[PDB]
Curated annotation (Swiss-Prot):
It comes from Homo sapiens (Human). A zinc finger (C2H2-type) spans 4-26. Expressed in germinal center B-cells. Transcription factor that can function as an activator or repressor depending on its binding partners, and by targeting negative regulators of cell cycle progression. Plays a critical role in early lymphocyte development, where it is essential to prevent apoptosis in lymphoid precursors, allowing them to survive in response to IL7 and undergo proper lineage commitment. Has been shown to bind to the promoters of adenovirus major late protein and cyclin D1 and activate transcription. Required for early embryonic development during gastrulation. The chain holds residues 500 to 528 of 803 of the full protein. Homooligomerizes (via the BTB/POZ domain), multimerization is required for DNA binding. Interacts (via the C-terminal zinc fingers) with GIF1; the interaction results in the recruitment of MYB to the CDKN1A/p21 and CDKN1B promoters and repression of transcription. Interacts with TRAF2, interfering with the binding of UBC13 to TRAF2, and inhibiting TRAF2 E3 ligase activity. Interacts with MYC (via the C-terminal helix-loop-helix motif); the interaction inhibits ZBTB17 transactivation and growth arrest activities and renders it insoluble in the nucleus. This is Zinc finger and BTB domain-containing protein 17. Coiled coil: none annotated. It is found in: Nucleus.
Amino acid sequence: MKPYVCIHCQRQFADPGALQRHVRIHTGEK
Ligand SMILES: [Zn+2]
């Protein structure tokens, strides 16, 4: 039902841990 969506690109993920992995992917450098 409820995903964890990327605030920056609006991609729906499962886990909040993946969002943190995801968001830092946008930074790239970190
Ligand atoms: Zn994203």
